[PDB]
């Protein structure tokens, strides 16, 4: 997260870190056994780290739970990043508590201008790399589809939205992928992609979770 702020430990209790011996993506806990992340975060060997704040220090409240299933959306296109959503089933249900909590899926899509919280342990620099220890947060609005498509012509599918800032300086960034964009208590987005990070006129692009709620529910229900 570039241009964000330290969330505060466990203030984003649905934020998970996907770890493969290092934090590589975020995710969002959507129930005690399932995490939503980005399909492009798929890999083997995912350990979901819940309850994290400092991802480099065991501070307490962490639960590290292996992924038992990582379900990339069947129509994920790794070139266009359409359907950039993955569900991870935890090998065991997380113990939910104030620091490890699910986030609700949307019941409807969010409108442009909806303010959301994007969080992650991604790079905090728009140029160069600095990976934080602690979870970073960014309040960011969903941009209009027109602005999003203007920023990323031909690249924004109906399953994506832009959020953030066009003036630069505030965005999700590498290492934030898969993590949440939560708006009014609903997981509306998954950090997916963008042209660089926090670049002027290049807002973050996020998987539009509301388009996947049924898929998520159906997939969870069948797994």
């Amino acid at each position: 997260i570039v241009g964000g702020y330290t969330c505060g430990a466990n203030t984003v209790p649905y934020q998970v870190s996907l770890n493969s011996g290092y934090h590589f993506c975020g995710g969002s806990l959507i129930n005690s056994q399932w995490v939503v992340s980005a399909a492009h975060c798929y890999k083997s060997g995912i350990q979901v780290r819940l309850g994290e704040d400092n991802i480099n220090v065991v501070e307490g409240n962490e639960q590290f739970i292996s992924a038992s299933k990582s379900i990339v959306h069947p129509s994920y296109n790794s070139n266009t990043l359409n359907n950039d959503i993955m569900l991870i089933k935890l090998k065991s249900a997380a113990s939910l508590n104030s620091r490890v909590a699910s986030i609700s899926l949307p019941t409807s899509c969010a409108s442009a201008g909806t303010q959301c919280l994007i969080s992650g342990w991604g790079n905090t620099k728009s140029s160069g790399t600095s990976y934080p220890d602690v979870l970073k947060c960014l309040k960011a609005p969903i941009l209009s589809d027109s602005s999003c498509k203007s920023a990323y012509p031909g690249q924004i599918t109906s399953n994506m939205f832009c959020a953030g800032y066009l003036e630069g300086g505030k965005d999700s960034c590498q290492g934030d992928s898969g993590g949440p964009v939560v708006c009014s208590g609903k997981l509306q987005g998954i950090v997916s992609w963008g042209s660089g990070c926090a670049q002027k006129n290049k807002p973050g692009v996020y998987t539009k979770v509301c388009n996947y709620v049924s898929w998520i529910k159906q997939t969870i229900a069948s797994n």
Partner: peptide
Amino acid sequence: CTKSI
């Protein structure tokens, strides 16, 4: 560009 590490 995807935002993974």
